[PDB]
């Protein structure tokens, strides 16, 4: 039903300006990186944001994929973030899949982006410190202005 509209290479940074990357175990993590470090570390730092449909109130229906040794797409299934081995779809039948996120700017702050899970309404991509690592997780939005669910998206 909905054909892919656009496909944008992107560097994604979290609330503390750390850059998202896929590690050798296919885990989404963040680390402090200059724009130079981010290029040095491609393709593990370069995310393909594929857009399928405007669905405001919630946002733009997108998938987020990365190409390293294989192409993986981000999934929020079971409220657990993972990279799933699959290509972004040419066409989606609807916007309900666990690989769909609604990308929306934070109201009033046009360059701060949120990514809301389609399949789990009110849950969002977030950065969270676990032990030594900074991880990409899915988090319930418990209050407004939670910077951990806000990102910078740089076009490439």
């Amino acid at each position, epitope marked *: 039903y909905f054909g892919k509209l656009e496909s944008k290479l992107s560097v994604i940074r979290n609330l503390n300006d750390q850059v998202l990357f896929i590690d050798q175990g296919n885990r989404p993590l963040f680390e402090d990186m200059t724009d130079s470090d981010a290029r040095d570390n491609a393709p593990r730092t370069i995310f393909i944001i594929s857009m399928y449909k405007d669905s405001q109130p919630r946002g733009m229906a997108v998938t987020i994929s990365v190409k390293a040794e294989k192409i993986s797409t981000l999934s929020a299934e079971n409220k657990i973030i993972s990279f799933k081995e699959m290509n972004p779809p040419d066409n989606i039948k609807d916007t309900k899949s666990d690989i769909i996120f609604f990308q929306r700017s934070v109201p*009033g*702050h046009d360059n701060k982006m949120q990514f809301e899970s389609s399949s789990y*309404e*009110g849950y969002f991509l977030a950065a969270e410190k676990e032990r030594d690592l900074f991880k990409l997780i899915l988090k319930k939005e*418990d*209050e*407004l*202005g*939670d*910077r951990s669910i806000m990102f910078t998206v740089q076009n490439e």
Partner: antibody
Amino acid sequence: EIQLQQSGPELVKPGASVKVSCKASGYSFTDYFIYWVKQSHGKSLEWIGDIDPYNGDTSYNQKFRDKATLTVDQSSTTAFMHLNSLTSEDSAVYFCARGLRFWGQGTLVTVSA
Amino acid sequence: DIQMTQSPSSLSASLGERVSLTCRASQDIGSKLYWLQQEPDGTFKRLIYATSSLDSGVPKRFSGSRSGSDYSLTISSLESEDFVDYYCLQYASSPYTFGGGTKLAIKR
């Protein structure tokens, strides 16, 4: 304990300006925006604006964008709202909040000559 | 801007009664609604977030639901402390906007 501690009630003259403060404690200040809300007799609750304490970015209700100026002081983990050009219509209780979840106790501002 | 029409602005009821307050949004806000309670001294407490999630430390008699562009806060059985003010708030779009409030009063 998450706390937002607001400054005391103010009595201020029409045409003057006032600056009210909102001291945050019990969490990492720069992880959450601070919101400001006006409660009046005449217009009930109105959102004024917000601020990102990490970079100072602000958003306003267009009704209040030339009335209110939001700032923070990172070191003291305090948010401020400055109101200019005061009139009787600015008399109200002003609240700060984290997340529109945790709220300050409010600051009454009375404008009178 | 999105207008949140909150009704009724006053509701008279009795201890033990089940009551429901409603907020109607002028545009689609999805699940992006809070319900707030305010005590007489001005203290706010959030009750419900994201339409139907109950905050911690809120009595279980409070619940939130949606049916269409109507959002409701239901109190299953009123207690004395419940006869205060209530407001909804939408966060779908800027500027964030509040309902005009409901005061819960004692019937006589």
